[PDB]
Design a protein around this ligand. Structure first.
Ligand SMILES: OC[C@H]1O[C@H](O[C@H]2[C@@H](O)[C@H](O)[C@@H](CO)O[C@@H]2O)[C@@H](O)[C@@H](O)[C@@H]1O
Ligand SMILES: OC[C@H]1O[C@H](O[C@H]2[C@@H](O)[C@H](O)[C@@H](CO)O[C@H]2O)[C@@H](O)[C@@H](O)[C@@H]1O
Lengths: 101, 103
């Protein structure tokens, strides 16, 4: 993971991470990834190894360089604040954001 | 954005846009993008900078080349007609649909 060391000017909008990331040729690329493919809302907490968190979460934000923050619904349908470190699994590969396991 | 300038046979089904786009060096690729990731319903109006419009909108359609049209609930729970131009932020990047920023 660790895209945040390869990238800058990062932003969160909805479930899409955008970032500007370094390229081996000296340039850079503006990249984007839909995090909803790889993050699940499990009982109010953001977790890896699933999907579709955006259906049951609101108010997504980037905190610092790599933390996704949101408010998500528990199974009993109430809201809690939650966060996940995107650096865990989001990398930059020659300027392009990618999920890595 | 401006995908519609490089793309063909676009379609919307639920929250998903699918299109067939000219690749940078020739030929075509087909890709999809889930618009639910980047479009919110604010009081009956489709807007960028949020997500999950599909929870409170229905009957989504493609109008012309690039407009998402749906019926979305206002806060008062009245369905109203709304549209958003997907060319605002959806690009064709070497034949693949991608959300892009404002720079
Ligand atoms: O309903 C879509 C939802 O399904 C799964 O989430 C389950 C649970 O973890 C949630 O707390 C509640 C919130 O209402 O919904 C579920 O029952 C996950 O796939 C989740 O990502 C998704 O949004
Ligand atoms: O309930 C999910 C819904 O939340 C937001 O919408 C707000 C409001 O703008 C909308 O008119 C009504 C419709 O009932 O729901 C409100 O509380 C927004 O994030 C939207 O995208 C989402 O569907």
């Amino acid at each position: 993971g660790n895209f945040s060391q390869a990238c800058y000017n990062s932003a969160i909008q909805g479930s899409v991470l955008t970032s500007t990331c370094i390229r081996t040729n000296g340039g850079y690329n503006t990249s984007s990834i839909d995090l909803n493919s790889v993050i699940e809302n499990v009982d109010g907490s953001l977790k890896w190894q699933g999907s579709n968190f955006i259906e049951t979460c609101r108010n997504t934000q980037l905190a610092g360089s790599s933390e996704l923050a949101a408010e998500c619904k528990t199974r009993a349908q109430q809201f809690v604040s939650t966060k996940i470190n995107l650096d865990d699994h989001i990398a930059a590969i020659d300027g392009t954001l990618k999920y890595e396991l």
